[PDB]
UniProtKB/TrEMBL annotation:
Keywords: FAD, Flavoprotein, Nucleotide-binding. The keyword DNA repair does not apply. PANTHER family: FAD/NAD(P)-BINDING OXIDOREDUCTASE, FAD_NAD(P)-BINDING OXIDOREDUCTASE FAMILY PROTEIN. Gene3D superfamilies: 3.30.70.2700, FAD/NAD(P)-binding domain. This is FAD-dependent protein C-terminal domain-containing protein. It comes from the Bacteria. One of its GO terms (molecular function) is nucleotide binding. Residues 281-477 form the FAD-dependent protein C-terminal domain. FAD binds at residues 104, 123-124, 153, 157, 164, 229, 502, 510.
Length: 534
């Protein structure tokens, strides 16, 4: 195929302005174009769309490329097809175990299953429809199920999200593309393959994971929901199995740990058993809300409401006198601050949107880095203890209700702790209790957020508006531990055991966690292949 890039077309171009641009650029008639894909559609945020098209032409394309050698924007389309590194030897009697069915476990298990390894996937949480019952019900009737909530269950933490797929580091093996093609293959909107800043929306995420679960089952994988791993079978730096919370055993010498960074109990057990772990730094802050219209105004203006440009977003970063860095994270256009606790007596904030991104508010976590040996002890589990501390406190300030501590921008900045709501209303649910957020984070984080928000007002007008809403505590932005593994993908002090995903400290989102899943599946495969060789 032939790749043409830097095709500029007005925002409101008619259909097949694309094809016209193919013929204009390659001097070929419509009739020679067998087909084309949109490989990338972006825009310059100052409108004009920017495409990169991959084109199948009839005849000798090799000849056509030659006549354009001197054109930088006419390349040969790279070979982006995912390569299965192996296939399961027919010898196999041992099925690899995968612990957790978030994006990371999802791809470790899908890739293992596609290579005929017949992986067993366990998930402490539930199938996504019952999970949705448990979670929406927590949000409404304040009854929390510690095993089945925003953190735990089918699809892991990705499920109740805006489903943004973030930029990644370099990826010559096209892991990224492999993840998204599977998404699309399972019903995700085709758009996500080429659009800039793609998003899937929580509802689409739900139908998607189901299909993908069916796809792994059909392939010979096994998926056991409401099934929690509570201990590992260890013997001389070698794992040979796992024990379930029900007391059942499963024996295997290949075990992927992809449990997310909320698997605190699991983290405790791993410590108790001597698996190696290091304190990892991370961020904490508050969910902030403004009217989504005030963001549309600051980013677009008249072109606001356009069905392509979508709901506006933003991305902000401030270096405070404090020495700390405040930034915005998981920004959710027209979305909902969500109640993300997985623990009794703890309040946790995060963010979510629907595909349509049509709620009244724009939100995002405004967070600031904290570090082991600066902000808490340096023992491996100390970040966790510090989180639980932050979460217990917010529950408390929130009225032991599962309501969330909240304060208007205006008085948090100023210290006028008491004031009551303006027009920006809380999306957090069960609900919120106005209070003094100064009490909610460490003195240096509050000071940094305090400095950062007006500095943000300068970047987007209204960001420091008095009525804007600050909610809850966002405490779980990345893992407080590194379950270090090294080039082997194996725990540095335990063979057969594969630390993976966000939980391990090796991913930071849906796409990257999925990418890690693939890499891990590939290394479990290779290892098994090398083992089965003779
Ligand atoms: C509300 C919210 C919104 C988000 N929005 C976005 C977004 O727009 N874009 C983005 O890229 N990311 C988003 N994320 C982040 C994201 O979902 C994670 O980074 C990603 O899911 C990590 O995948 P993972 O498989 O490594 O871990 P997880 O997603 O956390 O999956 C871990 C699974 O393992 C299970 N588990 C834990 N312990 C055990 C055990 N002992 N036995 C069996 N199972 C166990 C858990 O229940 C869980 O289901 C969001 C997260 C949240 C909470």
């Amino acid at each position: 195929m032939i790749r043409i890039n830097e095709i500029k077309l007005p925002l409101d171009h008619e259909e097949g302005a694309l094809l016209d641009a193919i013929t204009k650029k390659l001097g070929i008639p419509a009739e020679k174009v067998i087909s084309f894909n949109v490989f990338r559609r972006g825009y310059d945020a100052r409108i004009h769309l920017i495409y990169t098209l991959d084109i199948i032409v009839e005849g000798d394309e090799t000849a056509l490329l030659a006549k354009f050698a001197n054109d930088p924007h006419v390349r040969q389309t790279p070979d982006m097809e995912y390569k299965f590194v192996a296939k399961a030897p027919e010898n196999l009697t041992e099925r690899p175990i995968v612990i957790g069915f978030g994006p990371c476990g999802l791809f470790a298990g899908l890739v293992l299953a596609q290579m005929g390894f017949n992986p067993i996937i366990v998930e402490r949480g539930k199938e996504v429809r019952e999970r949705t019952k448990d979670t929406f019900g927590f949000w409404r009737k304040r009854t929390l199920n510690p095993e089945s909530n925003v953190q735990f269950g089918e699809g892991g933490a990705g499920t109740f999200s805006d489903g943004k797929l973030y930029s990644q580091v370099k990826d010559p093996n096209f892991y990224g593309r492999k993840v998204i093609t599977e998404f699309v293959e399972a019903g995700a909107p085709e758009e996500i393959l080429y659009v800039s800043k793609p998003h899937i929306g929580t509802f689409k995420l739900v139908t998607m994971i189901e299909k993908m679960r069916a796809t792994i089952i059909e392939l010979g994988g096994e998926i056991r929901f409401s099934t929690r791993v509570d201990d590992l079978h260890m013997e001389d730096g070698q794992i040979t199995g796992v024990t379930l919370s029900n007391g059942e055993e499963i024996k295997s010498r290949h075990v992927v740990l992809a449990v997310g960074h909320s698997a605190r109990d699991t983290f405790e057990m791993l410590h108790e058993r001597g698996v190696y772990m290091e304190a990892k730094p991370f961020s904490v802050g508050f969910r902030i809300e403004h009217k989504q219209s005030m963001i549309d105004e600051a980013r677009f203006g008249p072109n606001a409401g356009h069905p392509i440009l979508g709901a506006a977003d933003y991305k902000l970063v401030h270096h405070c006198k404090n020495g700390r860095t405040v930034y915005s994270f998981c920004m959710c256009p027209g979305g909902t601050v969500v109640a993300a606790t997985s623990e009794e007596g703890r309040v946790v904030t995060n963010g979510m949107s629907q595909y349509s991104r049509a709620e009244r508010n724009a939100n995002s976590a405004i967070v600031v880095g904290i570090s082991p040996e600066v902000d808490y002890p340096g023992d491996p589990l100390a970040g966790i203890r510090f989180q639980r501390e932050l979460e217990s406190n917010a529950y408390k300030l929130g009225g032991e209700n599962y309501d969330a501590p909240a304060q208007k921008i205006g008085d948090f900045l100023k210290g006028r702790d008491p004031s009551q709501l303006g027009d920006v209303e809380p999306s957090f649910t069960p609900g919120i209790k106005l209070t003094d957020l100064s009490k909610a984070l460490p003195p240096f984080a509050v000071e940094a957020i305090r400095e950062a928000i007006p500095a943000f007002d300068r970047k987007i007008k209204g960001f420091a508006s008095e009525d804007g809403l600050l909610t809850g505590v966002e405490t779980r932005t990345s893992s407080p531990v590194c379950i270090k593994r090294g080039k082997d993908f194996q725990s540095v002090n335990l063979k057969g055991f594969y630390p993976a995903g966000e939980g391990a400290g090796y991913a930071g989102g849906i796409l990257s966690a999925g990418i890690d899943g693939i890499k891990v599946a590939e290394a479990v495969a290779r290892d098994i292949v090398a083992a089965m060789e003779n």
